[PDB]
Symmetry: D2
């Protein structure tokens, strides 16, 4: 088994754990430790009861510095100092660092100093790492020597595979995206009741895209709003393409990719569905074919769904396996 440690037990951290068990990936991966600067009581409770995902099916037990999920024992640490973590003693193959705040070499190297073989960040970090993976797109670029890696971000994993598919088919020359987020300072917007408004929020989506697709620097922008719905995101993508195209052809391309090389990663639907119907859906992206439009023959719009959190947590596990099982 690949022995994994979770640094930080916020929403992504807890989701990685549930997804490990629910997906059957536990036959190949085991979680041996979680570091979180909060009490084990609350951790265990929040792991068992989720608003967005419901009741977790495995017995959850907490005792001393141990968290139990079914039979598995899991050490709970409260360390402010990354180098003082017991990674070597626990035989840590991969630390999944889910703390948020940027990722980087210094931090990865501190997990490695404590004795972890590799590090996978949940957040894009800086342009300094051994690699950034959008699983389903570029995991075959990983090498045995890539030890400090980033899995991109919740929102980037949703849209990148779609962008890849459209650009391969038609050549993207320009792109603009709006993300409609579900519910989840020097900004007079935070101190406003989320219950009733469409609230614009900061987004780093564009940076994510142009870092992954450097041929689009100065060619991509993004905005975002928050709305009071349940954990499903809609990404509204508008791209100009080189080759002329019609909507039913954009749709055929995406249907077949979901059928084929992107099965499990990008799904496609034509059914009359609403966002909750993708709650807890493990795909990175579900293209809603009913919303595909082409203006003229060069301006594509697609509406893409994702459970950004559940999709991403599953990909985190996919990337962890790819990292842990590569030959030099």
């Amino acid at each position: 088994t690949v022995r994994v440690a979770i640094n930080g037990f916020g929403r992504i951290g807890r989701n990685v754990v549930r997804a490990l068990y629910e997906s059957g990936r536990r036959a190949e991966i085991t979680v041996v430790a979680i570091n979180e600067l909060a009490d084990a009581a609350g951790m265990a409770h929040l792991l068992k009861y989720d608003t967005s995902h419901g009741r977790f099916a495995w017995e959850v037990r907490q005792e001393r510095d141990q968290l139990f999920v079914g039979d598995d024992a899991i050490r709970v640490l409260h360390e402010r100092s990354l180098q003082s973590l017991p990674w070597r003693e626990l035989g840590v193959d991969v630390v999944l660092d889910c703390t948020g705040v940027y990722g980087s070499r210094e931090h990865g190297e501190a997990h490695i100093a404590a004795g972890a073989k590799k590090v996978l960040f949940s957040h894009p970090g800086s342009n300094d790492l051994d690699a950034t993976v959008v699983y389903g797109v570029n995991q075959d670029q990983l090498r045995a020597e890539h030890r400090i890696v980033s899995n991109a971000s919740c929102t980037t994993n949703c849209i990148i595979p779609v962008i890849k598919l459209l650009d391969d088919a038609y050549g993207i020359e320009s792109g603009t995206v709006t993300t409609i987020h579900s519910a989840m300072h020097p900004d007079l917007r935070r101190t406003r009741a989320a219950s009733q408004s469409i609230i614009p929020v900061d987004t780093k989506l564009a940076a994510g895209i142009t870092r992954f697709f450097p041929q689009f620097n100065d060619r991509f922008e993004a905005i975002a709003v928050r709305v009071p719905t349940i954990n499903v995101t809609a990404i509204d993508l508008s791209v100009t393409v080189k080759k002329p195209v019609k909507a039913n052809e954009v749709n055929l391309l995406l249907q077949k990719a979901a059928q084929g090389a992107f099965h499990g990663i990008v799904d496609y639907t034509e059914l009359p569905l609403v966002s909750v119907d993708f709650n807890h859906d493990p795909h990175s992206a579900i293209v809603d074919g009913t919303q595909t439009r082409v203006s003229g023959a060069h301006l594509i719009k697609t509406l893409v769904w994702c459970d950004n959190e559940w999709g991403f947590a599953n990909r985190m596990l996919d990337t962890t396996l790819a990292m842990a099982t590569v030959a030099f």
Copy 2:
């Protein structure tokens, strides 16, 4: 005083009335009659309470066959045949048809035959009316012989003025729009039965065909989708267009900002404040450009996010259009 009658007292009919008093337009226009099918105890209560900006500030009551707003008496009518509406007896200058159902030349003629000089429809109607007005964009296209006019639609009015501004400055080549609508058993459209509170729900939208009617040149160059989210009374419109001329986000904002100071004052507003949607609740502008959200990808793909209280701006535009029709008039 411009004599008006309102046919249909649903959300829009009621908002037209509220707008008339709140805006001061009542110095210019008097509502002589309201035609509504369905009890009138309702009418008063809904006028009073279903408002969204506090209880309507004018005193409201229902006596006899009459509705009282403040000290004004309005004749309440219940008539199913357009032919027998007593517009002639009341000397009605414009009938504001707010039913959401009547929209054809023949419906127009039917109102005019019962004695209205002119008719204004609260929705796009048929493709062959005398004119379709987006107040602030093309009221000047109203001739004297145009007795049957459409006011376009709530959503259409939000966006066409920004489209005009953008087209004139940079030349729109193609365009795509997403409307984020606020909230309003078994049904053949399967999405409609679903709990609204929980979801982003894709909805059918007529916006593209509205843009297309107004801008003949944009046929086959414009598309639209929409979703409904569980927020209240303010719509956002997410507009992406390719333009001929090379532009930056800052120049697009200056343009729109200057236009809001000048020729679209009172119609299109502009802002750079960190505001949220409820901040435009009961705002009477047709559109509010949110400067902070403006992007240009490359130098030719503009994204603008526009807000509106779709019902409130529309109701106000109905009154504005009324006066212009009355202005140069048959």
Copy 3:
């Protein structure tokens, strides 16, 4: 195997099918037919996709006037009159009439006449049926010759067991209830405002019908709030015997452990309404909220997934009816 047909494929009828498969009761009940006025594609669709209960696990296909759940075929009918339902041909043991509109003795008689052996109504219905069952409280009042039975109402089901527990231990003198409803006609014409909306409720009438000694001693009100489909029931009773709040919690905790296990649950954990979504208990007593004013006025807060709990009790009462 009990052969059941379902009349009305509204939310209730659909949860009855979902629950049938999820609890494993496929082993003792078979659904042989559904009558629904609307078309079978709509039915299959709604069965699969649900805002409250997520994606249904079993494969759902629709094919002509057949509906397929897993390997199972279910005839779909569109009869608007009870007399023409093919209950004889299909050998129906129990109609589960979930329409919310057929509830009288003569509606039961028309189901029987068409060949159904018995009928279980998914609502209080007529006041002159053979029995009204709130499972866990009075299924032992059931008899073989009871042919036209009512299953009470979802909200009645949530609270009646708790009322019985409290009346037995301390003697209820008077009672008053507020139901806080989720996404479940004077005020409907309003616009969207995200409001607490008062709604008419029949809970007082359901409580006194089940406990007639409470006539003129019980009242209830309700509000709708824009939440997910878990109801909170806020029950305030005056009682004869003096009590403290911790005594009340012990009694219900023990009730949950014992005679009401699987019907009433009990929690002292810091939960919120979504934590009871898809819970098949009729009621979950929240101990953290129990209060006693003085020593005689008890307040209890009780949670329920009113739809889910109720659809499972319908199944229980069904089995109890068929293999008597």
Copy 4:
């Protein structure tokens, strides 16, 4: 004119100012000064824009240390030290302290020593202030010798007048209350959980507040509360046992009459079929919903009570303020 200063410009302090301008009380009360740590530009923006109460009808400008409401200039302070507040300079007759921090006899003494003649706190406070006033019920218990006064709390202000009314008519023996809060505000494990889906139990000091005010109901009153995702209007579900025998129509008639007479402008009564937003920005402390009144047997009364907790409370602060500067 009574000169007043406001200490703390959060939600309550801003609402007092809005309430002042909207009620016409600007003829009797002048706000000479606001002390607030945050920036003036922020104060102005938040005074102008508010999700509950909407766009302030009065112009709002901010320049330097001045906040302009209409054409009234108001002095802004940023002083952490009560001893240094320039009250004497400004001739402050009453400090409305709306910080929700300050609340003790000493804090009161500090304001007075800095030169404010009297003090009104916007909350419970501590158990030894000169008076606690729920305006409409006990403003008669005010004496000129009362210098350090508390206004009670929002919810306590909504329900006390009703309890008074029912106790006076019928003799209340015992009481229990559930408060249905909208989106407003031992580690509470529920506070993580997203407001947008659930009914969420929350701690309440309502009973404490009632006990404090009516110590004869010591051991005779309890309260729970929940939060639901509605906008700014609270429902209070009050269930009391009474000594006298009563009927629901008699209860409603009592309360309707009190609303016509002795509690006019403080308690309102309605028989109309309404919803909670209908009371948004309603200045009464309480609106009894007559459609919802019940009595079980002849002694167990339920009434459902609405209030815009923040707006009624803002208006009461001013009522008390006015009763504190005039004892002549």
